[PDB]
Design a protein around this nucleic acid. Structure first.
Ligand SMILES: [Mg+2]
Ligand SMILES: [Mg+2]
Ligand SMILES: [Mg+2]
Ligand SMILES: [Mg+2]
Ligand SMILES: [Mg+2]
Ligand SMILES: [Mg+2]
Ligand SMILES: [Mg+2]
Ligand SMILES: [Mg+2]
Ligand SMILES: [Mg+2]
Ligand SMILES: [Mg+2]
Ligand SMILES: [Mg+2]
Ligand SMILES: [Mg+2]
Ligand SMILES: [Mg+2]
Ligand SMILES: [Mg+2]
Ligand SMILES: [Mg+2]
Ligand SMILES: [Mg+2]
Ligand SMILES: [Mg+2]
Ligand SMILES: [Mg+2]
Ligand SMILES: [Mg+2]
Ligand SMILES: [Mg+2]
Ligand SMILES: [Mg+2]
Ligand SMILES: [Mg+2]
Ligand SMILES: [Mg+2]
Ligand SMILES: [Mg+2]
Ligand SMILES: [Mg+2]
Ligand SMILES: [Mg+2]
Ligand SMILES: [Mg+2]
Ligand SMILES: [Mg+2]
Ligand SMILES: [Mg+2]
Lengths: 106, 127, 206, 151, 98, 96
RNA sequence: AAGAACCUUACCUGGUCUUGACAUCCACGGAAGUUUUCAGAGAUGAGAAUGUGCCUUCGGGAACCGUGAGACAGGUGCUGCAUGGCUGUCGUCAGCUCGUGUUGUGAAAUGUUGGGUUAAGUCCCGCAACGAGCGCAACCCUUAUCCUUUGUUGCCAGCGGUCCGGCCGGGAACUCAAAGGAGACUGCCAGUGAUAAACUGGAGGAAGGUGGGGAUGACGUCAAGUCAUCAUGGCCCUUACGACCAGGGCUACACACGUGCUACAAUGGCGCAUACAAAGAGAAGCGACCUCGCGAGAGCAAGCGGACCUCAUAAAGUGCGUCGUAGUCCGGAUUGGAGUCUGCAACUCGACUCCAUGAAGUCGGAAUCGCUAGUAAUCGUGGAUCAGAAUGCCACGGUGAAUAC
């Protein structure tokens, strides 16, 4: 998109290539640099991400999940009861998780 | 001076030279009426001239070959309108509206294997 | 029979002609007959030399003949005796002075004619047809060859009923005229009848 | 027709009178792609009609058409598993299309000497609304009237 | 004076061959009226493809013959000879006669 | 195709180019308007295979009598075979 | 079967041969070859002249021809229900699948379904699916516009005169020829649409929405067709199911069906005059001109391997005149006589010409076929096969519709 062949050929395919770039970024974005299966998984909503929970359990990866009163535990290694819809509540969990993980190997 | 236009219609090709003179038409060293100016397609040659008047203003010297009576007459009409660009491009506004600018691309269709001509198919029976 | 010959359809687009001489109608038929006779003798004589294609051209009442083979040393022998004998026979058949050229064929497993010839030879030696097909496909893909595809037919393994059982790998755009396909065939003469083998090999797009 | 609603093909007007309607008429009369033969027949017939009734070429021809243009016709529908004949109004262009077609068939059946004479007599009777073409219009109207129950 | 007409089965080779004749003749002499295309001949064939019956299934092949003409007008002298021994052709037919 | 039949064709060609093409004067020169005597017409005891209009013009490779093409010297199907893999110079599938 | 008088040709009746018509091997003898005669339907036997051209420690040789024994040769003989190769068909219909993942005990499912949209499994959005392949589309040929180069055998706008013929100097404009480029992209505009895909309309443009036509035929189905094009397993025959020759047949004829041509007429028949094409072929060939014949053709004899010469006058059409609705000046079958050409040979069984003859047929029952535009209909022209021979097949152009609510 910067150094390779983008302006070559017509514009239609260039529009197609850029359009597909946007699609791939949206679907698999901040995962591109992971380069291997994780060793922990944090979820915001257990019921809404049951597919992700099942995959982690299949691969034997620890799972931390925020579960609401309508969610299903026993697919979660570390259950965290609480609201998972309110933006304020979600921001609180993410900030705390972001802070605690920042202290890495030190 | 002379102004030129080619014109073509289904295997016919014209060559028209229009001059700002009298109102006579000569085709293949013959008069319009003598050539086909009374028989079929008499007026299609004149058609682009009733639009944007001619009266006696323009003299036409034309040579055409190939095709038939209607094909040649159509080629002449296309050439004349093509050559009528002597009066700049202000005429194409209404010549195109009339439909003389477009070249009619309607060649005869080649015949196919299994068919008797182009699209006619041999009679079919079940039993 | 519902597919066009992949080589013939691309003759003027990507593939070249195997004969490049010019002639009038007076000797057009005679040249064709002479070309057929040289090819049949030459391909019979060089059976063990792994010969891909024979290109014949006739400049100035002469005949050149170019042999594409994967075993040039065996074709040419010690220095030039056997190749010399070939030129003598070819000149005799063609009735004009004859040249001869040897073209090396690197990567014989990318040439369909050689691949098909290898498979048919194995079949006549009672090799399992499935094993031969898999081996040809896998080692061709091992060296470029984006689109190997192979096919066999008839009395497979001595069965009483014929079947085809083809097998492809990669991509083989047969409908793309731009594509560079290298189709060719061969026949095996096992004790139970004839087994036909077809090979498609797809290479760079243009 | 199943999918693609289509446009319309243009025809040039008649050389002698410059009318599209008359140009369509010669097309209906034409056979084997002989337009010069057809236009010759029509012009001869029109001239005979004009001198017969005075009037004029176009006006006499139009008067004849007005006595043969249909207004309603039947059409099998077959909705509920039974065959009906529901009357339907006729599109304005289809009117003269049927009128011109009917006139030509009447002329072809008429047993005079020349086609031009046949055509001149046929549409002359149409002007006085007593020809076979007029009879055809009356039958179509009468049949549609009988089936007026369906609509 | 001297006329050379070339025939071949593809236009790519004929154009290369004629250009060689033009440049060598122009270099070693004069004139050269320039290549002239002349009409192409298209010879068509139709053949049944089935070994038995099936009359309506057939292929249609054709051979296309290209033509050219140089028409050099100075016999010169160091030309006619140089024009010889310049075949270097493997599929284009050259007629040298006037 | 019944090599006997192919053997017949070669014999017919051999006779045709031996007797006729030089004895064509027999039917060409004499059988004209000299002024005659019909002794020449009696002189048609030649093998009867010397007549050029007695060869069937078979395919060069298979020898089948039908579907022949003069330019290539082959039958319709054999031409296609060769055409599809090169051989016939300049020949390609046609469309227009 | 892109062309059965002989041949082709297999089939029938007779007359013949047996290592053979076709191929290799061994031995023996002889160059090869050429001119004539007899018997025979011929195949084949019998003879007579003529020729003897190529190597050589030489039991023999190289090309060529006869005789003898074997190994063999030969088969259009059977099995397309043993096969390869090739082909039809559903169908140029838009579908058919796989890897990994996931669901189910499992056959399997998902993906490939759903909301829109497209000619399209075309595209966008959504979605336990994520990707990929064969298909669709594009790349190929041709046609429609323009530009550059080249300009003869093709062309003639502007100039000179001319036999008024581009004919002739001359000209490179134009037509054209054939190589290389430009051009069409929903690209631009307005509206609709989840703001997406896309759709409707407009401008421009030769061309507008995959511009027209062609080639291109997925996985598979019908034990579909072909052992007779060829190849091929098995089986079968081997003084015969092989091989040669003459004549006959494949062309029969109480009938039935398919596909076509020509008609039944006045939108026409006939007579006279006259205008406008495209695309092809030609050396065992196309065959000007001129003379002869009513004609098919014959004699003499240029040119052309061909933008040059020949085939080769396009016909419908257009002007006049006549026919006046009749089984006719419609129709041309059938038959008699007389001829031409090809071919060794036109009886069975060729094509065409001249004179005469002048059937049925007055628009066709039940039923049934093709076609959406340069199409149908109608009118001519060329080619392959081919000594000779199309109403068939494959191509070319002229005139040119009706109708899709
Ligand atoms: Mg096909
Ligand atoms: Mg030619
Ligand atoms: Mg055989
Ligand atoms: Mg013959
Ligand atoms: Mg016979
Ligand atoms: Mg017998
Ligand atoms: Mg089968
Ligand atoms: Mg499971
Ligand atoms: Mg599906
Ligand atoms: Mg499924
Ligand atoms: Mg859908
Ligand atoms: Mg797709
Ligand atoms: Mg989906
Ligand atoms: Mg496609
Ligand atoms: Mg002048
Ligand atoms: Mg528009
Ligand atoms: Mg079967
Ligand atoms: Mg079938
Ligand atoms: Mg059989
Ligand atoms: Mg016989
Ligand atoms: Mg028969
Ligand atoms: Mg008559
Ligand atoms: Mg009767
Ligand atoms: Mg009558
Ligand atoms: Mg359609
Ligand atoms: Mg016709
Ligand atoms: Mg011919
Ligand atoms: Mg013939
Ligand atoms: Mg036509």
């Amino acid at each position: 998109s910067q150094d390779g062949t983008f302006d070559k050929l017509t514009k239609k395919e260039a529009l197609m290539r850029t359009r597909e770039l946007e699609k791939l970024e949206n679907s698999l974005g901040g995962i591109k640099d992971m380069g291997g299966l994780p060793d922990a998984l944090f979820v915001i909503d257990a019921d809404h991400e049951h597919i992700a929970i099942k995959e982690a359990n299949n691969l034997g990866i620890p799972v931390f999940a925020i579960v609401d009163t309508n969610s299903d535990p026993d697919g979660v290694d570390f259950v965290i009861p609480g609201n998972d819809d309110a933006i304020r509540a979600v921001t609180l969990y993410l900030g705390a998780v972001a802070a605690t993980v920042r202290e890495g190997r030190s | 001076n002379q102004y030129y236009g080619t014109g073509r219609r289904k295997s016919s090709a014209a060559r028209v030279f229009i001059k700002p003179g009298n109102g006579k038409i000569v085709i293949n060293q013959r008069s319009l009426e003598q050539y086909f100016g009374r028989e079929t397609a008499r007026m299609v040659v004149r058609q682009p001239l009733e639009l944007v008047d001619m009266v006696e203003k323009l003299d036409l010297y034309i040579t055409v070959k190939g095709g038939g009576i209607s094909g040649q007459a159509g080629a002449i009409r296309h050439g004349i309108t093509r050559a009528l660009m002597e009066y700049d491009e202000s005429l194409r506004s209404e010549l195109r509206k009339a439909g003389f600018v477009t070249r009619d691309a309607r060649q005869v269709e080649r015949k196919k294997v299994g068919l008797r001509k182009a699209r006619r198919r041999p009679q079919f029976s079940k039993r | 029979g519902q597919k066009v010959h992949p080589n013939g359809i691309r003759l003027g687009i990507v593939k070249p002609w195997n004969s490049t001489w010019f002639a009038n109608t007076k000797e057009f038929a005679d040249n064709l007959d002479s070309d057929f006779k040289v090819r049949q003798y030459l391909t019979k004589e060089l059976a063990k030399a792994s010969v891909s294609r024979i290109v014949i051209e006739r400049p100035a009442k002469s005949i050149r003949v170019t042999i594409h083979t994967a075993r040039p040393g065996i074709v040419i022998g010690k220095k030039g005796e056997d190749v010399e004998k070939l030129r003598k026979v070819v000149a005799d058949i063609a009735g004009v002075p004859a040249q001869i050229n040897i073209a090396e064929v690197r990567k014989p497993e990318l040439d369909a004619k050689l691949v098909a010839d290898s498979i048919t030879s194995q079949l006549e030696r009672r090799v399992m047809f499935r094993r031969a097909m898999k081996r040809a496909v896998q080692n061709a893909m091992r060296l470029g060859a984006k689109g190997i595809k192979v096919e066999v037919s008839g009395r497979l393994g001595g069965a009483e009923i014929a079947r085809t059982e083809w097998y492809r790998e990669g991509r083989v755009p047969l409908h793309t005229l731009r594509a560079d396909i290298d189709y060719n065939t061969s026949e095996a003469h096992t004790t139970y009848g004839v087994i036909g083998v077809k090979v498609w090999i797809f290479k760079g797009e243009i | 027709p199943r999918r693609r609603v289509i446009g319309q093909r243009k025809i040039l007007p008649d050389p002698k009178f410059g009318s599209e309607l008359l140009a369509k008429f010669v097309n209906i009369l034409m056979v084997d792609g002989k337009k010069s033969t057809a236009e010759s027949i029509v012009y001869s017939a029109l001239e005979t009609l004009a001198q017969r009734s005075g009037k004029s070429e176009l006006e006499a021809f139009e008067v004849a058409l007005e006595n043969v243009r249909p207004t309603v016709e039947v059409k099998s529908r077959r909705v509920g598993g039974s065959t009906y004949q529901v009357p339907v109004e006729v599109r304005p262009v289809r009117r003269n299309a049927l009128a011109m077609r009917w006139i030509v068939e009447a002329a072809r059946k008429r047993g005079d000497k020349s086609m031009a004479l046949r055509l001149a007599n046929e549409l002359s009777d149409a002007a006085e609304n007593k020809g076979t073409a007029v009879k055809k219009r009356e039958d179509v109207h009468r049949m549609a009237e009988a089936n007026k129950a369906f609509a | 004076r001297i006329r050379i007409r070339l025939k071949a089965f593809d236009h790519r080779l004929i154009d290369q061959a004629t250009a060689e004749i033009v440049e060598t003749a122009k270099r070693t002499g004069a004139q050269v009226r320039g290549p002239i295309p002349l009409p192409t001949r298209k010879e068509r064939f139709t053949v049944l493809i089935s070994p038995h019956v099936n009359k309506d299934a057939r292929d249609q092949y054709e051979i296309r013959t290209h033509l050219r003409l140089v028409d050099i007008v100075e016999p010169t002298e160091k030309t006619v000879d140089a024009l010889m021994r310049l075949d270097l052709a493997a599929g284009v037919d050259v007629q040298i006669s006037l | 195709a019944k090599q006997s039949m192919k053997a017949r064709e070669v014999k017919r060609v051999a006779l045709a180019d031996k007797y006729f093409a030089k004895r064509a004067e027999l039917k060409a020169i004499i059988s004209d308007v000299n002024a005659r005597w019909n002794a020449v017409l009696k002189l048609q005891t030649l093998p009867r295979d010397s007549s050029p209009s007695r060869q069937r013009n078979r395919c060069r490779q298979t020898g089948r009598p039908h579907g022949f093409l003069r330019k290539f010297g082959l039958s319709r199907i054999k031409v296609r075979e060769a055409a599809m893999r090169g051989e016939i110079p300049g020949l390609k599938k046609a469309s227009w």
